[PDB]
Amino acid sequence: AKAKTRSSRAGLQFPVGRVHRLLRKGNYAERVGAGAPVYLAAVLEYLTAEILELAGNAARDNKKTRIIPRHLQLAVRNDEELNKLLGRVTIAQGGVLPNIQSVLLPKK
Amino acid sequence: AKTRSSRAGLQFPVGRVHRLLRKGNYAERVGAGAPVYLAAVLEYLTAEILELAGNAARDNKKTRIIPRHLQLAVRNDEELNKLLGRVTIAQGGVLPNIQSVLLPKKT
Amino acid sequence: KKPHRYRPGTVALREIRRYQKSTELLIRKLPFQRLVREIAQDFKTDLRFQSSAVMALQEASEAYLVALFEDTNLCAIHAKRVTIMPKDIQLARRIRGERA
Amino acid sequence: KKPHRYRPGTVALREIRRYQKSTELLIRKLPFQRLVREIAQDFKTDLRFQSSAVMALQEASEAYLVALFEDTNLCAIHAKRVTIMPKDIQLARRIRGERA
Amino acid sequence: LRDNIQGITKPAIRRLARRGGIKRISGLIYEETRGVLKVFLENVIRDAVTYTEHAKRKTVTAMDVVYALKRQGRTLYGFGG
Amino acid sequence: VLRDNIQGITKPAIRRLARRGGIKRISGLIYEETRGVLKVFLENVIRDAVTYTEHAKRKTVTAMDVVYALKRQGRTLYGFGG
Amino acid sequence: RKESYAIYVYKVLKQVHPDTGISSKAMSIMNSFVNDVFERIAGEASRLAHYNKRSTITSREIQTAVRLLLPGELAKHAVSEGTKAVTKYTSAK
Amino acid sequence: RKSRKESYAIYVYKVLKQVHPDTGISSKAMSIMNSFVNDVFERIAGEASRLAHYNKRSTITSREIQTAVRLLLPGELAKHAVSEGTKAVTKYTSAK
DNA sequence: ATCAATATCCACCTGCAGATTCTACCAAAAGTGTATTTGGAAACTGCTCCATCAAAAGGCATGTTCAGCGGAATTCCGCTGAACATGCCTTTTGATGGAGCAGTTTCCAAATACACTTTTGGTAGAATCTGCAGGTGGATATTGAT
DNA sequence: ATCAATATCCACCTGCAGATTCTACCAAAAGTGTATTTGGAAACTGCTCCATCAAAAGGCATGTTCAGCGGAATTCCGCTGAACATGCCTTTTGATGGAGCAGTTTCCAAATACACTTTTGGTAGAATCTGCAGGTGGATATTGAT
């Protein structure tokens, strides 16, 4: 059928039609250009890829194949930028990074 | 023809506030009671801060409220202080406050 | 027999290692649920709670406290101690703006 | 017998009362402006500035620094000192979340 | 024989402390912590309940809690939104 | 060619700020630290301000640009139009 | 033509302190203050409405916004003046 | 008549397999990703909204989404987000 | 405690810039008055999923002992505060050219607004499938005592 | 250094809770084609205000000297938190009615949308006015040496 989704056109996995729909209805402005949702979906997809890429490694590192919350937390807090971007975000069931103030370590 | 402000018994502009709400794109629609209520609240708050800034002016033997007076009034009131907890009033200074351990002598 | 005893701090260190590894909630659920409901009762009566709503609140509170314990430790260490105290939590909250 | 000298700390307290009592900016106006134009310039060239834009940055900057010193002072006093040091400033910024 | 905030026990407060990297704890910390936890919950719950009553419900939903957390600048991932 | 202006933030000015800040005694290393802290504060506010300028396709940084940038950073400023 | 709340701030000023004036810088801060709280309340109402699949902001969302945003006593009094003003505006055309 | 509940889950997953073909993800992790996407969406959209208002515009275009991104994301993350976004808008525009 | 060197306090005073005072223009508001559209309150209802009660489960309260940490006391060195001489650079009052922001008209490429057609992501219920958390065993590193 | 007591690892095992693949029913999207509308850039330009060069001058930065006392290092000891084994009461797990959370239907007060008419908050500009900063003197502390 000759009806190709805007996502396929922009060559993205994320749903352009939806991001567009969500912008209009979020009362962000009177009008919304046609490229805004494309651009925006492209940016949402990329960040999603960045985190899954790192959370995935964190999983391999624990000899695990399924990403769990812990993995997303290890991924985000070990990455300076993602860490800043999510500086005020709490990932449920993520724990903290193993870290012990040196002065508290036993006197070897 | 009465202004909507007078019908509500307010000094603040009901028509203007109702207008700013629409232009600010906060929702598809804006009920008529919304701007009336919001202008009342805005007006009430400026009355509280001016009530307090005016006293501070009086306390500093002045007749014209200046920024320092607004700052004194805000920082000295727990609630306004909180509401403006992350606000900076230009030319307002800080409240005089020296930590005890910094004072001399011993009693 | 050979009354084995670990020196002060060794098990504690062992515990930090363990808990920084895991992610389970550390407060018992029921007691926490009771506290939440009791505090809510002051804002509105006869309220019900989705299971998920209490879990969200517990996840949020523990993450908040664990982080406050982090800055607190930093305040103790700043004062050359290894023992956290109230003055430490109080200083941390004051600088966080939850204080002067 | 002849010279008169205030003891260390008396003029400092005199000064705190003096400055806590007023509101004028404490950094020299022009030098502050050159600093703004330098930092700005090394971000984007050929930029002009409304004078009030420079004044708004100075007002924000001084309020930020004054509030930071308060926090620092509390960190020094926490360590049983009256002299603020770099590490006090670092502790305060770490807890404020500027390097936490 | 039962006060709720005391239900948040010392052993639990100690485990939390541990996750935060704490090695030695002063006795006065346990009571101090409860007090902080209580202020935390009141601030969050109050906002959630306000979102509950606005929606005319009698049940606090995870979303009412998530929205309250977001307002307090304590954004939480995992429970919707 | 502006070069080392961070030094215009004189030792006496940093000291006055510490006074309003209620500070009685200052270590010798405080001055360079403070300058470092101010440069970063300024870089961040100017970066965002200048970004609002360019988005508006202007060549002049306005007070609103600075006010909007400050608000982004949670340092809302009253007095200059916002 | 740039609008401002000045005449209104001034009116209210004369009601609470008949013989006090205000410098322009202070009025500038007052104007910032009104716009600030205004945006804060509306933003709050905006989200409140969306969270409830509502396309309309009424006196009711403005009220919750006020309860969500303002500290204890100030909320209590703003809500009263708010309710009061709406009821009065209602009783007339 | 049980009303829908949209989510980015299927797209998150699609993206997962391109990056880690043999990796899975648990429900709780998916919910977090979903929260992550809605959060950035709101932050970016919200900022673009203000940008327009400041400049008295009624329209949010890719221009606003771009500046929004520069103001929101940290350096390198913003660099790639900008290029990815520009890439998609380009590829889109150049297609019947 | 008495006393001299200084800073603070403060009511009196007057040039000035910043504020209050018209006068007029007035177009963009804000209001009045039909016509047309619709959101969401309200009543009714079905199915979750939440509060409750019971029983099997495992973490916490409690008292003892003493290691070691925190803080009091003492000490000394050197760094930071005060005071002072010297002189420059900020600040101040002014004018000038022109960059560039902003007002105004002009008009098209892009967006909204239905109406129609097709695709699809979410839901429900059923069956199938699997990553991995604990459970065991045995090796070995860690820690604390002599 | 030398065991002895424990904690920690690692390789392997397997049962099931939660992930997956399956299929269909479908309302809500999302794409598409047509008609209508309009935001906002391009273009011309009036005009605010930014950059800048100028000059006079004293407020304020700089740099030095000197020594008061704060920081920090060390010693030391009373005490309070850590570890631990003892004993059990509270939490947790799994099963069952019912309250509300929502999904539907309905309809009415209320919110566009549009056309005029009317009131007004800006403001450009002039003229008048007033609070107060800031200069002065001298009366009331505050400090610090003795």
State the CB neighbour count (10 A cutoff) for residue B25.
Answer: 18
Judge if the beta carbon of D87 is closer than 7 A to nucleic acid strand I. Answer: no
User: Rounded CA gap, F82 and D52, in Å?
Assistant: 12
The vertex-F39 CA angle with D20 and F36, nearest 5°, equals 85
Give the SS3 label for residue H90.
helix
Cα nearest neighbour of B28 on chain A: A27
- G81, B40 in Cβ contact below 8 A? yes
Residues with Cβ within 8 Å of residue B13, at least 6 apart in sequence = B3, B5, B39, G8
DSSP symbol at A102: G
* Tokens found for residue G85: 């003003």
* Tokens found for residue D86: 């770099």
d(CA E67, nearest CA chain C) in Å: 11
Resolution for this PDB entry, in angstroms: 2.7
**Which chains border C (3 or more CB–CB pairs < 8 Å)?**
A, B, D, E
DSSP symbol at A37: H
| Residue of C5, A14, C43 whose CA lies nearest to E64 | C43
CATH assignment of the domain containing B14: 1.10.20.10
What does the DSSP assignment read for C6-26? PPTTHHHHHHHHHHTT-----
User: Rounded CA gap, A9 and A34, in Å?
Assistant: 13
User: Rounded CA gap, A52 and A59, in Å?
Assistant: 10
Q: How many residues does chain C have?
A: 100
β-bridge partners, B30: G57
| CB-based contact C21 A95, cutoff 8 Å | yes
The residue segments making up the domain with residue A42 are 1-108
* Tokens found for residue C52: 């998920």
CA distances in angstroms from D52 to A56, D23, D56, F39, F60, listed in the order given: 50, 17, 6, 20, 12
Tell me which chain D residues have a C-beta less than 8 angstroms from the C-beta of C74: 91, 94-95
Give the closest nucleotide to D28 (alpha carbon vs C1').
I90
β-bridge partners, H95: none
β-bridge partners, E25: C84
User: Rounded CA gap, D76 and D72, in Å?
Assistant: 6
Residues with Cβ within 8 Å of residue D66, at least 6 apart in sequence = B94, F17, F20, F21
Query: Residue G53: left if φ>0, alpha if ψ -120 to 50, beta else—which one?
Result: left
Helix (H) or strand (E) holding C84, with range, is strand C83-84
State the CB neighbour count (10 A cutoff) for residue H57.
Answer: 15
| Residue of C94, C41, C43 whose CA lies nearest to C72 | C94
User: Rounded CA gap, A105 and A103, in Å?
Assistant: 6
User: Rounded CA gap, B28 and G57, in Å?
Assistant: 8
State the CB neighbour count (10 A cutoff) for residue D24.
Answer: 10
- E64, C53 in Cβ contact below 8 A? yes
Give the SS3 label for residue D99.
coil
Helix (H) or strand (E) holding F25, with range, is strand F25-26
Query: Which one of C65, C71, C77, C93 would you mutate to disrupt binding with E, by most E Cβ within 10 Å of its Cβ?
Result: C65
Give the SS3 label for residue A9.
helix
The residue segments making up the domain with residue E46 are 1-81
Q: What's the maximum distance between 2 C-alpha atoms anywhere in chain D?
A: 62
What does the DSSP assignment read for F37-73? HHHHHHHHHHHHHHHHHHHTT-SEE-HHHHHHHHHHT
CA H94 from centroid of its chain's CA atoms: 21
* Tokens found for residue H82: 């900008």
Residues with Cβ within 8 Å of residue B3, at least 6 apart in sequence = B13, B14, B15
Contacts across the A-G interface (CB distance below 8 Å): 3
Residues with Cβ within 8 Å of residue D49, at least 6 apart in sequence = D36, D37, D40, F60, F61
State the CB neighbour count (10 A cutoff) for residue C20.
Answer: 19
State the CB neighbour count (10 A cutoff) for residue H17.
Answer: 13
**Which chains border E (3 or more CB–CB pairs < 8 Å)?**
A, C, G, H
Judge if the beta carbon of D97 is closer than 7 A to nucleic acid strand I. Answer: no
- A54, A32 in Cβ contact below 8 A? no
d(CA C99, nearest CA chain B) in Å: 11
User: Rounded CA gap, B89 and B81, in Å?
Assistant: 12
What does the DSSP assignment read for chain G? ----SHHHHHHHHHHH-TT-EE-HHHHHHHHHHHHHHHHHHHHHHHHHHHHTT-SEE-HHHHHHHHHHHS-HHHHHHHHHHHHHHHHHHHT--
Whether B97 contacts chain F with CB within 8 A: yes
Helix (H) or strand (E) holding A43, with range, is helix A36-61
What does the DSSP assignment read for chain E? ---SGGGS-HHHHHHHHHHTT--EE-TTHHHHHHHHHHHHHHHHHHHHHHHHHHTT-SEE-HHHHHHHHHHTT--EESS--
What is the torsion angle, in degrees rounded to the nearest 10, for the CA atoms of residue B80, residue B85, residue B90 and residue B96? 80
User: D51-78 vs F63-72: helix axis angle to the nearest 10?
Assistant: 30
β-bridge partners, F76: B87
d(CA H22, nearest CA chain F) in Å: 40
- A70, A94 in Cβ contact below 8 A? yes
State the CB neighbour count (10 A cutoff) for residue H71.
Answer: 22
Residues with Cβ within 8 Å of residue F53, at least 6 apart in sequence = D44, D47, F59, F60, F61, F62, F65
Task: Determine how β-strand D83-84 pairs with β-strand F76-78.
Answer: unpaired
Alpha helices, DSSP H only, in H2-93?
A: 9-19, 27-54, 62-72, 75-93
Residues with Cβ within 8 Å of residue D31, at least 6 apart in sequence = F5, F8, F9, F10
User: Rounded CA gap, C98 and E37, in Å?
Assistant: 13
Q: Which nucleotides of I are covered by protein (CB under 7 A)?
A: 5-8, 11, 18-20, 28-32, 39-40, 48-51, 59-61, 67-71, 79-84, 89-91, 99-102, 110-112, 118-124, 131-133, 143-145
| Residue of A38, G48, A105, C48 whose CA lies nearest to B34 | G48
- G23, G6 in Cβ contact below 8 A? no
- A2, A11 in Cβ contact below 8 A? no
Q: Where along chain H do its domains lie?
A: 1-96
Give the closest nucleotide to G5 (alpha carbon vs C1').
J121
**In angstroms, how far is the first alpha carbon of chain B from the final one?**
70
Place of tokens 């912590």: E33
Give the SS3 label for residue A104.
helix
- C58, C27 in Cβ contact below 8 A? yes
Query: Which one of D17, D22, D23, D96 would you mutate to disrupt binding with B, by most B Cβ within 10 Å of its Cβ?
Result: D23
User: Rounded CA gap, G63 and G66, in Å?
Assistant: 5
β-bridge partners, F25: D83
Show the 3-state SS of chain B. CCCHHHHHCCCCCHHHHHHHHHHCCCCCEECCHHHHHHHHHHHHHHHHHHHHHHHHHHHCCCCEECHHHHHHHHHCCHHHHHHCCCEEECCCCCCCCCCHHHCCCCC
For residue A66, the one-letter residue type is R
State the CB neighbour count (10 A cutoff) for residue C3.
Answer: 4
CATH of range H1-96; options 3.30.460.20, 1.20.210.10, 3.40.50.720, 1.10.20.10: 1.10.20.10
Pick from A19, A68, A81: which is nearest to H76 by CB? A81
Cα nearest neighbour of E19 on chain A: A96
User: Rounded CA gap, H65 and A36, in Å?
Assistant: 6
Q: Which 8-27 residues of chain A approach strand I with CB closer than 7 Å?
A: 15, 24
State the CB neighbour count (10 A cutoff) for residue A24.
Answer: 15
* Tokens found for residue E2: 């039962």
Domain C1-100, what architecture?
A: Orthogonal Bundle (1.10)
State the CB neighbour count (10 A cutoff) for residue G31.
Answer: 21
| CB-based contact D95 C100, cutoff 8 Å | no
Give the SS3 label for residue F8.
helix
- A41, A15 in Cβ contact below 8 A? yes
Whether H96 contacts chain E with CB within 8 A: no
Judge if the beta carbon of C31 is closer than 7 A to nucleic acid strand I. Answer: no
CA distances in angstroms from E24 to A99, C4, C62, E20, E57, listed in the order given: 16, 21, 19, 12, 45
Give the SS3 label for residue A62.
coil
| CB-based contact H32 E78, cutoff 8 Å | yes
Pick from A92, A99, A101: which is nearest to E76 by CB? A92
For residue B58, the one-letter residue type is R
Helix (H) or strand (E) holding A10, with range, is helix A6-10
Q: Where are the beta strands (DSSP E) in chain D?
A: 48-49, 83-84
* Tokens found for residue F53: 């300028």
Pick from F78, F80, F81: which is nearest to G33 by CB? F78
Q: Where along chain D do its domains lie?
A: 1-100
User: Rounded CA gap, C34 and B88, in Å?
Assistant: 41
| Residue of H77, H5, H75, H88 whose CA lies nearest to H40 | H77
- G89, B38 in Cβ contact below 8 A? no
β-bridge partners, A66: H24
State the CB neighbour count (10 A cutoff) for residue F12.
Answer: 12
User: Rounded CA gap, D91 and D77, in Å?
Assistant: 13
The vertex-D69 CA angle with D68 and D74, nearest 5°, equals 100
- H67, F55 in Cβ contact below 8 A? yes
Whether F50 contacts chain D with CB within 8 A: yes
Helix (H) or strand (E) holding D62, with range, is helix D51-78
* Tokens found for residue H90: 């380009």
Tell me the CA–C1' distance in angstroms for D27 and J128: 38
β-bridge partners, B64: G21
Cα nearest neighbour of G25 on chain F: F79
The tally of domains found in chain E comes to 1
DSSP symbol at A63: T
CATH of domain G1-93: 1.10.20.10
Pick from F8, F18, F20: which is nearest to D35 by CB? F8
Task: Determine how β-strand D48-49 pairs with β-strand F25-26.
Answer: unpaired
* Tokens found for residue E72: 């307090």
Helix (H) or strand (E) holding C49, with range, is strand C48-49
Q: Which nucleotides of J are covered by protein (CB under 7 A)?
A: 4-8, 18-20, 28-33, 39-40, 49-51, 60-62, 68-72, 80-85, 90-93, 99-104, 110-112, 118-123, 131-133, 143-146
Residues with Cβ within 8 Å of residue G49, at least 6 apart in sequence = B26, B27, G55, G56, G57, G61
In the PDB record, what is the listed experimental method?
X-ray
User: Rounded CA gap, C80 and H57, in Å?
Assistant: 56
User: Rounded CA gap, C66 and E22, in Å?
Assistant: 10
Residues with Cβ within 8 Å of residue C44, at least 6 apart in sequence = E49, E52, E53
- Burial grade of B43 (CB within 10 A; 0-12, 13-18, 19 or more): buried
d(CA E24, nearest CA chain A) in Å: 9
User: G59-69 vs E29-54: helix axis angle to the nearest 10?
Assistant: 170
β-bridge partners, F60: D48
